[PDB]
Write a protein that binds this DNA or RNA. Structure first.
Length: 91
DNA sequence: AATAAGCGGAAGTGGG
DNA sequence: TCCCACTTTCGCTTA
């Protein structure tokens, strides 16, 4: 099954949910969610995973927080903004 | 108050 | 056995 960071990177590359997520500085790997349209993206994540419950942005963001220690995605001190690692961007 | 973003102890589910 | 990679529940903090 796809990993969450890869699901998000793939969306950013495809442009398929441009109103829910976008690059801030793609060279740095920084990206941001839409305040008003992030839930539709979270719903898509949960359906792609086949999870039992409806996925929420809060549960998805909790998964994102767990990447902080391994480094794939880090929270940026800007609203709804995160940053992929160079390793994730290079793969 | 109402709303929203951000955080995490603990415990459950999947597929190794 | 016991870690993977989240998922789910619920309370808390700050703005």
């Amino acid at each position: 099954k796809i990993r969450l960071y890869q699901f998000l990177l793939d969306l950013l590359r495809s442009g398929d949910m441009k109103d829910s997520i976008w690059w801030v500085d793609k060279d740095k790997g920084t990206f941001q969610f839409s305040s008003k349209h992030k839930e539709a993206l979270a719903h898509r994540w949960g359906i792609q995973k086949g999870n039992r419950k409806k996925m929420t942005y809060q549960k998805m963001a909790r998964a994102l927080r767990n990447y902080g220690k391994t480094g794939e995605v880090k929270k940026v001190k800007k609203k709804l903004t995160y940053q992929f690692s160079g390793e994730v961007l290079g793969r």
